[PDB]
Write a protein that binds this ligand. Structure first.
Ligand SMILES: CCCCCCCC/C=C\CCCCCCCC(=O)O
Ligand SMILES: CCCCCCCC/C=C\CCCCCCCC(=O)O
Ligand SMILES: CCCCCCCC/C=C\CCCCCCCC(=O)O
Ligand SMILES: CCCCCCCC/C=C\CCCCCCCC(=O)O
Ligand SMILES: CCCCCCCC/C=C\CCCCCCCC(=O)O
Ligand SMILES: [Ca+2]
Lengths: 467, 8
């Protein structure tokens, strides 16, 4: 058995005792930190400090029982280990609560704010610690049984799979769904929208009207240009077609490539550019076009809608994957995919929307697309959550591998040499309770401010203490 | 009475 002196367990338990106390006091005393995320972080600091306190308290009790020299050891063992088990389940729940808090505050920011009042968050955190303590007591009673060890190992692989999903989305696929703020900016334009729109419509020789725009690839079962081309055919026979201007861009297959220019010729008010324009001119098009139509059959990332919403274009897209999660009711119009008749109704509905001042609608699109920036506070909380789970996974990894060996290869000589280093895995677990306060401070500017007001009072609650 | 559980 790997030996480390009992001084370490008591010391590490005290460091986290002071750190996580400072975390809870700071979040409570600061009115700006009364958000649901910091309330789940507050409970995470509670479960973190109870673990390191219980491990330090257990070491003192262990060092006392072997010296004074029974059957009372088993009872205090069943209670100390019950606090560790209940806090571990709460530590997993507090991390998943932040994950749920980050998923909803990113996509459905306002609907989550109304339902997650200051009262309802206290009920959930209370219910989490209720089911965790009840499950913690039953886990320790049947700690040698199979269902308990299979359950805890499963919970670690769940946190491991969620961490792998977060590293793939945030870091690997960073440039896949990340909006570019330095490029998709209205500052690169000049004038008003109708001023730029008349210049664009005169550049193609057209009367001023409601300008719809499609950009993408001409394919038969992917981007959905066939849905839009038949939507123009349906709208062709109507009377409201004369107030519309369509600009379709994208090269694909000659069957649809020729159909686009077939409608461009038989209608005049339709412009078809079978070339791949530079990103600088597509930026200029979004700042002038009234509505951007994205009739995609499959769009995993809403980046195509975010790029147009930054420059004030109002998207008319399908409720498919990424376009579904980005576009709400106030910042666009959604329709069923593959339906050309329903898309024509959205184009007719968008024509009626143009009769009022869309300056607020475009200001909602700019605001909605502005929150998905990598340097924004919304996506920054997801990276803070990825650090919190990646830290918890690494610190608890050797323990759960020892838990796997306990049930899969206890007699194996190689698994025995690993399980004998268990006292190292306890120290690593206690380091999760010390590193976590360092993560909240490093990734929260408001928490460092209230940290300085306490480190200055810790120097001020000492002059009045000695005089 | 071991440090933590799953020790004996
Ligand atoms: C073992 C039992 C441990 C009991 C822990 C009880 C509560 C810990 C979490 C406290 C809630 C902090 C948030 C307070 C609030 O939001 O009002
Ligand atoms: C439920 C738990 C969810 C865990 C993941 C949490 C947040 C994921 C954030 C996804 C980032 C959205 C990218 C924007 C886009 O798709 O264009
Ligand atoms: C198979 C389709 C693969 C597309 C990846 C999208 C996954 C995602 O949005 O996170
Ligand atoms: C393996 C763990 C699961 C990995 C990825 C989950 C799928 C990504 C999210 C796609 C659906 C999101 C949505 O549009 O609601
Ligand atoms: C598992 C966590 C995956 C989180 C995916 C959220 C983004 C959904 C999407 O727009 O594809
Ligand atoms: Ca024990």
């Amino acid at each position: 058995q790997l030996f480390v002196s009992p001084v370490v367990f008591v010391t590490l338990g005290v460091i986290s005792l002071l750190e996580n106390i400072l975390v809870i006091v700071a979040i409570a005393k600061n009115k700006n930190l009364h958000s649901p995320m910091y309330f789940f972080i507050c409970s995470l600091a509670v479960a973190d400090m109870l673990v390191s306190v219980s491990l330090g308290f257990e070491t003192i009790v262990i060092t006392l029982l072997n010296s004074t020299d029974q059957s009372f050891t088993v009872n205090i063992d069943n209670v100390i280990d019950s606090v560790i088990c209940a806090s571990l389940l709460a530590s997993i729940c507090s991390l998943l609560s932040i994950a749920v808090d980050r998923y909803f505050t990113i996509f459905y920011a306002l609907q989550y704010h109304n339902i997650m009042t200051v009262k309802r968050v206290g009920i959930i955190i209370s219910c989490i610690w209720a089911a965790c303590t009840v499950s913690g007591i039953l886990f320790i009673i049947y700690s040698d049984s199979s269902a308990v060890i299979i359950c805890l190992i499963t919970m670690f692989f769940t946190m491991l799979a969620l961490m792998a999903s977060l590293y793939v989305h945030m870091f690997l696929m960073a440039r896949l769904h990340g909006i570019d703020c330095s490029f998709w900016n209205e500052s690169y334009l000049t004038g008003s929208r109708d001023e730029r729109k008349k210049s664009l419509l005169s550049k193609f020789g057209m009367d001023e009207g409601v300008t719809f725009m499609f950009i993408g690839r001409f394919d038969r079962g992917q981007k959905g240009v066939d849905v839009l081309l038949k939507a123009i055919e349906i709208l062709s026979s109507k009377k409201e077609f004369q107030e519309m201007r369509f600009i379709i861009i994208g090269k694909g297959d000659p069957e649809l490539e020729g159909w686009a220019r077939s409608l461009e010729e038989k209608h005049g008010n339709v412009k078809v550019i079978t070339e791949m324009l530079s990103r600088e001119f597509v930026r200029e098009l979004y700042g002038s076009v009234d509505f951007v139509i994205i009739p995609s059959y499959f769009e995993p990332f809403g980046l195509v809608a975010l790029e147009a919403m930054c420059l004030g274009a109002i998207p008319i897209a399908s409720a498919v994957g990424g376009l579904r999660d980005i576009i709400t009711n106030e910042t666009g119009i959604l329709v069923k995919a593959g339906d050309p008749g329903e898309l024509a109704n959205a184009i007719l509905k968008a024509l009626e929307l143009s009769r009022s001042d869309l300056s607020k609608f475009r200001e909602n699109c700019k605001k909605r697309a502005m929150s998905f920036s990598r340097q924004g506070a919304n996506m920054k909380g997801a990276i803070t959550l990825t650090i919190l789970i990646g830290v918890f996974v690494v610190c608890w990894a050797p323990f759960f591998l020892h838990l796997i060996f306990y049930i899969s290869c206890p007699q194996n000589p190689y698994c025995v040499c690993f399980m004998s280093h268990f006292n190292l895995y306890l120290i690593l677990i206690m380091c999760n309770s010390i590193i976590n306060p360092l993560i909240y401070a490093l990734r929260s500017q408001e928490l460092r401010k209230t940290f300085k007001e306490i480190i200055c009072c810790y120097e001020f609650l000492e002059v009045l203490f000695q005089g | 009475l071991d440090p933590x559980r799953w020790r004996k």
